[PDB]
Amino acid sequence: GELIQKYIDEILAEAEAGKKLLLIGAGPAAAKAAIEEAMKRLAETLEELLGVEVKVEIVDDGEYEKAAKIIKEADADVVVFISTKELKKITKAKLINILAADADKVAVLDALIAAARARAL
């Protein structure tokens, strides 16, 4: 849908200009590994298509202060943060928030991967 298209437009445009990207997300205990996997798969897709270096960090659901500390201390031009709640004011990097409920986080990341490979074609 259009929101996914908007998200991948901004991620690709920002990554096209910047050099280092931080992809950070949060997951509940049972989904944390699958969410981290999806994030690494999106990271690899962006590295392969654009040539930008992408670091991945995963925190546990609700660890907003840990995420903010990671983001503020990251050497990154662009930050992509997927969470269910908007993060408060944080950073010199460009921040892109991806909003998604717990049960949708892997599906949203997978839709971004598929949108990026489609834009490549």
- Architecture of 2-120 per CATH? 3-Layer(aba) Sandwich (3.40)
Q: Any idea which residue has 């834009």 for tokens?
A: 119
Evaluate the CA torsion angle 45, 4, 72, 103 in order and state its sign. Answer: negative
CA–CA gap between residue 66 and residue 98 (Å, rounded):
18
Integer angstrom CA distances of residue 16 from 12, 31, 69, 77, 112: 6, 30, 25, 11, 16
What per-residue string of b and e applies to 15-31 under the rule 16 or more CB within 10 Å gives b?
beebeebbbbbbbeeeb
Identify the CA nearest to 35 among candidates 92, 83, 78.
Answer: 83
The angstrom resolution of this structure is: 1.8
- Elucidation technique: X-ray
